Amino acid sequence: MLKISTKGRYGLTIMIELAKKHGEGPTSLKSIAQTNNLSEHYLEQLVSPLRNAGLVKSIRGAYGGYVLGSEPDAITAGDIIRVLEGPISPVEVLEDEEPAKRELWIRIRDAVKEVLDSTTLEDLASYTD
Amino acid sequence: MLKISTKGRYGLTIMIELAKKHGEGPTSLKSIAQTNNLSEHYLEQLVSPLRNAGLVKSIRGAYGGYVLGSEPDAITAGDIIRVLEGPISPVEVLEDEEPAKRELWIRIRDAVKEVLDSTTLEDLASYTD
Amino acid sequence: MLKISTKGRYGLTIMIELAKKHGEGPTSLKSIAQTNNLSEHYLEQLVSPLRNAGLVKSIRGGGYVLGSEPDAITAGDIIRVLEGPISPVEVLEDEEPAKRELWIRIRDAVKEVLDSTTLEDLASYTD
Amino acid sequence: MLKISTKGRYGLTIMIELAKKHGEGPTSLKSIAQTNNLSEHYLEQLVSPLRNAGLVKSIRGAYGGYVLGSEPDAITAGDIIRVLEGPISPVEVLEDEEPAKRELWIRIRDAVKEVLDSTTLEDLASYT
Amino acid sequence: MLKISTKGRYGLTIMIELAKKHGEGPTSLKSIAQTNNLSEHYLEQLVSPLRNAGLVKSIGGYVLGSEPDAITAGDIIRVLEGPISPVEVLEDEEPAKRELWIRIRDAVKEVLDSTTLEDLASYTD
Amino acid sequence: MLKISTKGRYGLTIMIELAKKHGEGPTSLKSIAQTNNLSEHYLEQLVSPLRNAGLVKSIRGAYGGYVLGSEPDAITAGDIIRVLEGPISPVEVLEDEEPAKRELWIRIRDAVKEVLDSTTLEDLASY
Ligand SMILES: [Cl-]
Ligand SMILES: [Cl-]
Ligand SMILES: [Cl-]
């Protein structure tokens, strides 16, 4: 029933990897790409807006890479999704739709928004295998 | 992010129209279609599974049509969606997924399912005049 | 931007084939499926609503014919039965007129093509 | 039945905001984002191709921001959509689809293209 | 990339369950729905075309209309979702530009046409 | 049945145009856009990741433009798609889907990946 966009999935992956390595020095996009079986050049397109938003910082050099732009408990899943995908809309509200159905979509939207706004990177990084 | 189709939207429309007219005798698909500016012949494709699930009952005769198969408080948005669109719980996954990476999407899925399972036809009919 | 599904596409295929054979006796779904390289059992799922809408008639013994003259049936009539409404457009809550305007104009233009394109016109295109 | 992409919707929003503020000096992306309850960092991804196309101009400095690259009557909804989303193709045409159906998709495409090419930012900004 | 919907997914579920129970008497849609945690009334919408195509036979339950090795994923998908061959094209498409998408389409069709229910029934849980 | 993304379609178009002009000097995005009836400013959004991956090289100047970053036989359709779209996943795998269906999606994925990994720009440019 639920669909997860590639931008959102992998943008959150970058952030979670960085949260797991918080205080352990920079992490190269190359290593995140290698860990997650994807192109570093695909990942670069996702980090760019995260870097512009100050959610991540790029450290230059041979031992360079990315770090979080704030503590993991100060970044939410919602902060990340809003930068990469724009506003949250789980069910599109359509022109002249019945108020009962519009109310159902608002309730769904509020419940999704509450999950995004109450889930920090620290919380997600705490899940291990 | 949620894949509720035209089937689900209009299947909910039928159920809401019937909940608003609960205890007021049968309602024809023709009048529901007329009220909502849709083809009755599109709506007919949605009633058959709703009728098979016992969510609606067909009353024969010239003054016949449809009634709810239960009280509005005994039918949820989730009950309707499951019949018309299939399961609510499935979420897109990666093979051998790591708990940290999958977690956000599970929380979103659970929050959506909770809204759908806790919103009754009585609740939907209360959102409108 | 317009979501016409496989249902709509093949529902139009049925109607166009029947318009081409108008006044030439009944046409079986098997024949339409064979001509179009698809399953008759996929096409069967589309005929029932078209028949209920009176867009097609089933001849016992046999096959299908149009329920009206080709010039009296539009692409719009067919799409509404198989896919649902053509008008609804995705809107933002507390929408400003300037921002929504373009999408209303697009919706109206699409609806006009669908409502003014008849089966007689479409049946005149071949090969 | 009609789907509106996020890129198209919000790219068009930036342009409409700039058309409403035409002749009122530069407008920062931050204020457009604030007005529309969006991240400025989401909007940045849409403005870069619009700037590359000359549809918007960036004015530097303390009072800097964006302005339109031409008069609002000289920019169409079509000019904006082509930069952000590529070619206008409302219904995808499928291999070996019959000529009658191919014709219907072409007619829909032409009608959409006419609306896009005949609607200016001046026209859209005129709606209160 | 693929036009494989909930209809196709659950239509495959029905066929796989029936292949697993081949020669073990009829199986109801209710038990298939119970095994797979979904509505029997959603599955009921999928059986009618499978029955019309002779892929399933109705006896209170269903059996396969042929041996599991004689039914492919392609046979099932074609009935429920429509053709496998159509691919999105540009008008006046040049061969070099369309080629990759034709090759992808052919490879997908080959997987579907070469996968049988006997093969699929060997994967358990 | 098969859907082709705009990014993938046009990203591949850029690479194919460059492969056809390999050894014929630089090609501007303006001429590729003109040949393909699309905006150069839409194409520019696709070239930047391809340039970052070293799949194309930009030659500066008034007679500048793009060239391939390697020989056409050394670049695959898979190298291009992975940069622009991410991982190849034709049918999404859903939580708790039965192993028989998960296996079918893996087989589709492997067959698509084999086409992408075995098709070079030299191969495509030869048509
Ligand atoms: Cl890095
Ligand atoms: Cl700015
Ligand atoms: Cl260039």
List keywords for this structure.
HTH-type transcriptional regulator cymr, mainly alpha, homohexamer, transcription, hexameric, binds chloride ion, DNA binding protein, elongated, 129 residues, Arc Repressor Mutant, subunit A
How would you characterize the overall build of this protein?
The structure is a homohexamer. By secondary structure, chain A is mostly helical. Chain A has a single domain (1-129), classed as Winged helix-like DNA-binding domain superfamily/Winged helix DNA-binding domain (Arc Repressor Mutant, subunit A, Orthogonal Bundle), CATH 1.10.10.10. Helices cover 53% and strands 6% of the residues of chain A. Chain A is built from six helices and two strands, in the order H-H-H-E-E-H-H-H. In chain A, strands 1-2 form a two-stranded antiparallel ribbon. In chain A, strand 1 and strand 2 (65-68) form a beta hairpin. The longest helix of chain A has 20 residues, at 99-118. The two termini of chain A are 26 Å apart. The E-F interface holds E 1-4, 9, 12-13, 16, 36-37, 73, 81-88, 94-97, 99-101, 103-105, 107-108, 110-112, 115, 120-121, 123-125 and F 1-4, 12-13, 16, 20, 77, 90-91, 94, 96-104, 107-108, 111-112, 114-116, 119, 123-127. Strand 3 (92-93) of chain B pairs antiparallel with strand 3 of chain F. Residues 28-29, 65-66 of chain F line the site of one chloride ion. Chains A, B: One of its GO terms (molecular function) is core promoter sequence-specific DNA binding. Chains A, B: Residues 29-52 bind DNA.
